[PDB]
Tab-separated table of C-alpha atoms in Angstrom:
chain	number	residue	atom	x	y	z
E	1	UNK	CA	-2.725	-3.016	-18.123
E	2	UNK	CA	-3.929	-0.110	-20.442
E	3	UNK	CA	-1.893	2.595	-18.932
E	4	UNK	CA	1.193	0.635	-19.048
E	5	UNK	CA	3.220	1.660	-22.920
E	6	UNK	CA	5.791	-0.364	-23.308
E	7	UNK	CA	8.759	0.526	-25.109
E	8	UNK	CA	7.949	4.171	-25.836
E	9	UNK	CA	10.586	6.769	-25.708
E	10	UNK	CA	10.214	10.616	-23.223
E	11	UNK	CA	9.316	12.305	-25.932
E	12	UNK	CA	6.264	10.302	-27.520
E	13	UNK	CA	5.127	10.175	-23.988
E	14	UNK	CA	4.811	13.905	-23.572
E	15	UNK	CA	2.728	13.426	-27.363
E	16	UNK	CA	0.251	11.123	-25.832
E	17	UNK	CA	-0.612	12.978	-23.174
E	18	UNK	CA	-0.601	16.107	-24.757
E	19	UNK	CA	-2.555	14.828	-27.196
E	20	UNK	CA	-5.224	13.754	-24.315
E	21	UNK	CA	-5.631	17.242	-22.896
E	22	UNK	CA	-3.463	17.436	-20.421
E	23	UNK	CA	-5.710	16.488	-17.596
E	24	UNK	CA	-4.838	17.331	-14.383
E	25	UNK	CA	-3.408	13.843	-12.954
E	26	UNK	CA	-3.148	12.282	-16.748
E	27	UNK	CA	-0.129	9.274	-16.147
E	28	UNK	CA	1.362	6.097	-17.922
E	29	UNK	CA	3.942	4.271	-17.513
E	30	UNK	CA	6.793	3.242	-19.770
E	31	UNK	CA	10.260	1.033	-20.007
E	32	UNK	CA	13.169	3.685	-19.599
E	33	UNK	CA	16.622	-1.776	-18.835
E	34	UNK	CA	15.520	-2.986	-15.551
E	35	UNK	CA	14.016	0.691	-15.198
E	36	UNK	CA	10.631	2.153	-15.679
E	37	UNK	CA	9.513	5.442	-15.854
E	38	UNK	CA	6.172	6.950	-14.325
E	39	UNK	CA	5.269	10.193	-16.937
E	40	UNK	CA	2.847	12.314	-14.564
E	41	UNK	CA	1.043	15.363	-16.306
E	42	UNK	CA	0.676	17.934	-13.437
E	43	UNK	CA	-0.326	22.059	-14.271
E	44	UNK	CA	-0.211	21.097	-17.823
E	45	UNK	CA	3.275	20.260	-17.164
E	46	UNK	CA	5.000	16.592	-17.296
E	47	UNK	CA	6.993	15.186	-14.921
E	48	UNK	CA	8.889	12.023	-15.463
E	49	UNK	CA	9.856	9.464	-12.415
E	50	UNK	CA	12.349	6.897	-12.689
E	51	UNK	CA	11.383	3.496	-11.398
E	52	UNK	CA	14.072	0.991	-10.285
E	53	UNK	CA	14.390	-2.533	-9.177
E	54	UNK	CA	15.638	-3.726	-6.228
E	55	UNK	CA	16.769	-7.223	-3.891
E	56	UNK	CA	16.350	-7.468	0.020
E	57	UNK	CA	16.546	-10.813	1.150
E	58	UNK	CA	15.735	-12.932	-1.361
E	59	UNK	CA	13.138	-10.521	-2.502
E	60	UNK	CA	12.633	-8.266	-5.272
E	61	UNK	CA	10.549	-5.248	-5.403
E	62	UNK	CA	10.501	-1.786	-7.575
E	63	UNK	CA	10.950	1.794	-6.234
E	64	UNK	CA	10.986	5.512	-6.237
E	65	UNK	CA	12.560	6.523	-3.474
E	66	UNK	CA	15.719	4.232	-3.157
E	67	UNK	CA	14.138	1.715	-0.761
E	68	UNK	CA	12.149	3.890	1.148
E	69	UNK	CA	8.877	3.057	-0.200
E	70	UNK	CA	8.422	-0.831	-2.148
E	71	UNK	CA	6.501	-2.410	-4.356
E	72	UNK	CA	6.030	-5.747	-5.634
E	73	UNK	CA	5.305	-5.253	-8.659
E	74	UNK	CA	4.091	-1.911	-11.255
E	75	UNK	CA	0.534	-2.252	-10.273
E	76	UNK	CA	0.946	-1.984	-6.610
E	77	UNK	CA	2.961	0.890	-7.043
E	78	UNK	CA	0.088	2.453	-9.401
E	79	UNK	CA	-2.314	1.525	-6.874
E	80	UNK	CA	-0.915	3.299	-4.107
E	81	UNK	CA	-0.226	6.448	-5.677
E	82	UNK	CA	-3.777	6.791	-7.084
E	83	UNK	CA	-5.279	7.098	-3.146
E	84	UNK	CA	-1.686	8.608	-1.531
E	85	UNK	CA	0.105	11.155	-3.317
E	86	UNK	CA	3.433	10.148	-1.857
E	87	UNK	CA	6.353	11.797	-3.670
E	88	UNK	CA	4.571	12.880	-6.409
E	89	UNK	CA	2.776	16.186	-6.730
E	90	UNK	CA	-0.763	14.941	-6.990
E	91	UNK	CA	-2.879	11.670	-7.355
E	92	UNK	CA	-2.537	9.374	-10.424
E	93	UNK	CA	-6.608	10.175	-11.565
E	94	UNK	CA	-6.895	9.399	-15.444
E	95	UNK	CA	-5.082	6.989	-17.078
E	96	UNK	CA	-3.218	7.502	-20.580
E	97	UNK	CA	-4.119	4.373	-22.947
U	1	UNK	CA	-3.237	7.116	19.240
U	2	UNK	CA	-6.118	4.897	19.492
U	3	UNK	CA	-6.798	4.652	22.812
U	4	UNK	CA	-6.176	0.797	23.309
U	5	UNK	CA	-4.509	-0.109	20.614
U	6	UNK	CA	-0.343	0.112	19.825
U	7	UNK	CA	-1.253	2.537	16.505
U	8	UNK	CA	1.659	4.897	16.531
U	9	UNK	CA	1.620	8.148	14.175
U	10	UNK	CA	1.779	11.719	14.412
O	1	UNK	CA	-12.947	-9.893	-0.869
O	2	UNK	CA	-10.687	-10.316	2.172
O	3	UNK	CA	-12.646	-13.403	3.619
O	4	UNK	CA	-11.012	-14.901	0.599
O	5	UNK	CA	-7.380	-15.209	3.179
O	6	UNK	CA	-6.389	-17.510	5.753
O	7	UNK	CA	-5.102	-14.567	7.609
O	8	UNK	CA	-8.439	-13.301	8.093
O	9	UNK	CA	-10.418	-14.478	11.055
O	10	UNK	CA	-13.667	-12.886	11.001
O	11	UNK	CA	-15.065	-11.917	14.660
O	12	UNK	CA	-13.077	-12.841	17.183
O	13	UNK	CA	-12.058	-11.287	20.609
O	14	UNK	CA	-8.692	-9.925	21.147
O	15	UNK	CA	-7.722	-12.295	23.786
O	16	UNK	CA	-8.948	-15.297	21.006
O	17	UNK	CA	-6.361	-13.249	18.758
O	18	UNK	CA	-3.435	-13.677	21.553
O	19	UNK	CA	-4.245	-17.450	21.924
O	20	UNK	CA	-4.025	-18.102	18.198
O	21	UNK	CA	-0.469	-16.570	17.835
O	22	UNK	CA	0.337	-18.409	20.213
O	23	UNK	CA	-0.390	-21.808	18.998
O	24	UNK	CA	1.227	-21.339	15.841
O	25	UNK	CA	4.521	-20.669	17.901
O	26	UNK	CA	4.972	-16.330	18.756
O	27	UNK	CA	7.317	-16.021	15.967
O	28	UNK	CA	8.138	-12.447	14.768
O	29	UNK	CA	6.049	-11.351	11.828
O	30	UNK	CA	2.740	-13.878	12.580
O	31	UNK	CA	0.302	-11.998	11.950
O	32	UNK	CA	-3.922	-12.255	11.843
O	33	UNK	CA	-6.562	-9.246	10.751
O	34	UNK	CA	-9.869	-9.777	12.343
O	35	UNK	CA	-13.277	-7.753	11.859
O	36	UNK	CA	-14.174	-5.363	15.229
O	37	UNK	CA	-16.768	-6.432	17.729
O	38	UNK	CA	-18.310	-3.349	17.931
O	39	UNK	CA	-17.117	-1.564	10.110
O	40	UNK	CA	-13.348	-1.450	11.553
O	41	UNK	CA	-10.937	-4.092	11.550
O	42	UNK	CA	-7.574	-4.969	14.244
O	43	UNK	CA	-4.249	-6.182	12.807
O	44	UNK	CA	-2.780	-8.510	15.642
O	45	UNK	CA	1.079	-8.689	14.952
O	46	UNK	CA	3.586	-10.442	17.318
O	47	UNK	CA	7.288	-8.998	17.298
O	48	UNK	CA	9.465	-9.956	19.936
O	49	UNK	CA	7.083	-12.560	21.845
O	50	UNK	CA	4.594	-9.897	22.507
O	51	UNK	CA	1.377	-9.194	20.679
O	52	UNK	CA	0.033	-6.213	19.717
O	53	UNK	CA	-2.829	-5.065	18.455
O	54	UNK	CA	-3.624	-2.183	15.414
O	55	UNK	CA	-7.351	-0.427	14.976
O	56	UNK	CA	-8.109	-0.346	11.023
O	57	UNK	CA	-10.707	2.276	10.289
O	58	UNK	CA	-12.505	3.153	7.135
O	59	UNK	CA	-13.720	6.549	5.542
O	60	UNK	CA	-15.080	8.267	2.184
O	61	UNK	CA	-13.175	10.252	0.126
O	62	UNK	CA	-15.647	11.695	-2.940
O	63	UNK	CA	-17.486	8.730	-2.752
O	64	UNK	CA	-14.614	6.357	-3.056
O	65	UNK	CA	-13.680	4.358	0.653
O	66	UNK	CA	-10.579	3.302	2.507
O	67	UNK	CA	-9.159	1.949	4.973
O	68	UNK	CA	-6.159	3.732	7.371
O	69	UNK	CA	-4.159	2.857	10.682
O	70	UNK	CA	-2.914	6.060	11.202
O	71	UNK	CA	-6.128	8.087	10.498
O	72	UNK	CA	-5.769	8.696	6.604
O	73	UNK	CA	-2.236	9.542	6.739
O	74	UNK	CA	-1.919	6.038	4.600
O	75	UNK	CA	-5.252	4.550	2.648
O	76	UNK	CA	-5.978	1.290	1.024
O	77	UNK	CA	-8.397	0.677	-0.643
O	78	UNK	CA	-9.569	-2.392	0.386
O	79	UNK	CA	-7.287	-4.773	3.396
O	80	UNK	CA	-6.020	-7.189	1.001
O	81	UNK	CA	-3.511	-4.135	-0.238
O	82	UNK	CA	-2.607	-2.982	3.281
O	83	UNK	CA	-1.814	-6.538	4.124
O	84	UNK	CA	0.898	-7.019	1.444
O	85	UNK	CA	2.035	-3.117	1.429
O	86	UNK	CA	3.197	-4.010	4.886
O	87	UNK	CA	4.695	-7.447	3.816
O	88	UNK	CA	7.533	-5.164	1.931
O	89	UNK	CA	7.036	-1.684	3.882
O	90	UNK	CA	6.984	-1.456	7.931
O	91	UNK	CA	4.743	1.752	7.651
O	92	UNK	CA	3.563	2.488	11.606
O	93	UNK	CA	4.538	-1.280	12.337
O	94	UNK	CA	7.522	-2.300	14.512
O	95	UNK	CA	8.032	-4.972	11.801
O	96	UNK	CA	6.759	-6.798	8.904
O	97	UNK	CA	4.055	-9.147	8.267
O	98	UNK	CA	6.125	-12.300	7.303
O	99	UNK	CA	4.292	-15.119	8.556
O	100	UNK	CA	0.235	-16.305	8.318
O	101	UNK	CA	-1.422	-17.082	10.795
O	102	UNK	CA	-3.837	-19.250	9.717
């Protein structure tokens, strides 16, 4: 997945897509242990989103919002958010590689 | 609704 | 893409929807999407012995085209993803889609 990082820290994030333009809807997604972090450029100005994994019944999934809205897995939740805008300020449109 | 269906939103 | 499921039936009426569940036993959570007699889709869901029955719809957004129960409120993109959204999230639904029906 090309807008998946890795192991990158907050502040090379805010680099990368600064050095893309700062698009209007410009994301990626990085490793924060367990946790991941959504980095969402929005009126030239980046918010960060902490992802966090959870276990319901034998199940696990990965959320935002403390169990309120789940996902499976990263790409669900990347999937959603680029047609809903959810909790986030605006849709994910342009993907940071 | 959807008049004859069990769709339930605002 | 979604006739690629056992939980998709194609055309068939809703009472052929009703008689399914109930051979595979009107457990809570069996579930079937089938294609609209007369684009649009129903989700047939059974939750507490009773079935009902959920209109899918699609529309165009800047070319791009989903799919919404609660009239683009929620979108999918295609039925696959609102099938296992609402395996983890109830959404509109009284319950969750835990079981195939096949």
């Amino acid at each position: 997945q090309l807008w998946f990082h890795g192991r990158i820290s907050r502040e090379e994030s805010q680099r990368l897509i600064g050095q893309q333009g700062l698009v209007d809807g410009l994301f990626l997604v990085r490793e924060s242990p367990q946790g991941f972090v959504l980095s969402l450029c929005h009126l030239q100005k980046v918010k960060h989103y902490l992802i966090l994994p959870s276990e319901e019944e034998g199940r696990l999934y990965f959320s935002m919002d403390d169990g309120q809205t789940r996902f499976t897995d990263l790409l669900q939740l990347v999937e959603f958010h680029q047609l809903n805008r959810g909790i986030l300020p605006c849709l994910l449109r342009h993907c940071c590689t | 609704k959807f008049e004859g269906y069990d769709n339930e939103f605002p």
